[PDB]
């Protein structure tokens, strides 16, 4: 069996300031036990410093070992690619790490939103969005491209280059993701390259990992208030769902209500298991008399089997 090899770096704390001795640990596991040659490469060049301390550990039919490289502080900010090169059975395997480049190169920040459960489970047309906004306006265009983790071809995105009031440049790219591929966990990547950006912007999103839990929608009306004839508001507590992604709509006589009518709070973590959402909608008197089974619907990915949980609100 081919070995599964990973590479870890020492974490940086105090936040900001790096530790003085950055340590790189290349853990190679899941191999048939035997003889393995471990070396380290600085852009393909071998140093004199390494640690050969870690022995093999035969966990069943597989084994695991690693090696540690210790560095000075200033060598990490030299931007030199490091590679833990492992030779086994005449076969060559390599992992590389360098200093982690900034998420905002020189100030240019990119935010890649995930598709909500709305457009993912109702109309089945979900749109991923790469919003990169800090760019200075120049004659060169914003070279924006899209990729996946499995290398499958992506659809045509729509670019929205516009100069803002504060002299910046907004680049918005909306791509129609596949629903089945998003359920797979295919990592969608937005890559932005500019003439005056020193390195490429890479943003990646995946279907949110962790547990799965169906929502637990309860939807209440309110008791009649003295001096109130028109407000008659309704509340909807949706609780205990994994993950945070949830979309809440309201249904009047099997017609979808506008999103501006209801004030949906952000999913905040409850004490026990998941998250709670507290959507509240006010209905005027004409449709208060025309009640016809008010529905609070909460579309969610783990709401098996109908990907949708809804309840009923009655005034009486």
């Amino acid at each position: 069996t081919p070995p599964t090899v990973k590479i870890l770096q020492s974490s940086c704390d105090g936040g900001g300031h790096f530790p003085p001795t950055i340590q790189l640990l290349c853990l190679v596991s899941g191999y048939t036990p035997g003889t393995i040659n471990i070396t380290w490469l600085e852009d393909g060049q071998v140093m004199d410093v390494d640690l050969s301390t870690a022995s093999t550990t035969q966990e069943g039919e597989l084994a695991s070992t690693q090696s540690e490289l210790t560095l000075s502080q200033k060598h990490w900010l030299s931007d030199r690619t490091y590679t833990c090169q492992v030779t086994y059975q005449g076969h060559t395997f390599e992992d590389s790490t360098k200093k982690c480049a900034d998420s905002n190169p020189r100030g240019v920040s990119a935010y890649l939103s995930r598709p909500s459960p709305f457009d993912l489970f109702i109309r089945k047309s979900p749109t991923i969005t790469c919003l990169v906004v800090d760019l200075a306006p120049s004659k060169g265009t914003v070279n924006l491209t899209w990729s996946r983790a499995s290398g499958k071809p992506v659809n045509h995105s729509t670019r929205k280059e516009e100069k803002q009031r504060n002299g910046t440049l907004t680049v918005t790219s909306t791509l129609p993701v596949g629903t089945r591929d998003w359920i797979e966990g295919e990592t969608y990547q937005c890559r932005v390259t500019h003439p005056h950006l020193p390195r490429a912007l890479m943003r990646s999103t995946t279907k949110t990992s962790g547990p799965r839990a169906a929502p637990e929608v309860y939807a209440f009306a309110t008791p009649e208030w003295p001096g109130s004839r028109d407000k008659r508001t309704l509340a909807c507590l949706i609780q205990n769902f994994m993950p945070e992604d949830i979309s809440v709509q309201w249904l009047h006589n099997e017609v979808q209500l506008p999103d501006a009518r209801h004030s949906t709070t952000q999913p905040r973590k409850t004490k026990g298991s998941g998250f709670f959402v507290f959507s509240r909608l006010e209905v005027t008197r004409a449709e208060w008399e025309q009640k016809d089974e008010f529905i609070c619907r909460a579309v969610h990915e783990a709401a098996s089997p109908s990907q949708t949980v809804q309840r009923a609100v009655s005034v009486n």
Binding site: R106, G107, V108, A136, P137, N166, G167
Partner: protein, 170 residues
Amino acid sequence: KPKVSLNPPWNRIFKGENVTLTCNGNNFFEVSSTKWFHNGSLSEETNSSLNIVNAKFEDSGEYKCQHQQVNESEPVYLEVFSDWLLLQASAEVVMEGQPLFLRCHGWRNWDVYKVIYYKDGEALKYWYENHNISITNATVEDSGTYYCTGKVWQLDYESEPLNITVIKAP
């Protein structure tokens, strides 16, 4: 007439910055034969180069220099500020074709990011680092209330506004 020239040429400085005013003249002979008129009173400096080291708030105001029987120079207006961002200029009054300069100076020359220069409420220019703008030729439409907004330690701030007027030089 004698003239006052500043090194650096910013007439607006910070509380604690350095600027030397030089009494530049023609046929000046001996350099130690001039006097320094402050706002009102007489300064006791000599050698036609008055330096303001670690400038406080009281060093702002009218500055002129006098050399013998010819009268005092045209007074320059110094204005010591104390803010996160200061918009420094070569001159508030700039003739046609004279080189206009603007610089968004951070406090104690801190590095400023995402500096946006605004001319009367619209974005004149924007850059990710602290940048100057050096207009080689000045136009009469290149005037107004210039001010710069930037980021010092990842927080947005705002400089004091600067009234720059470019007039038609005869």
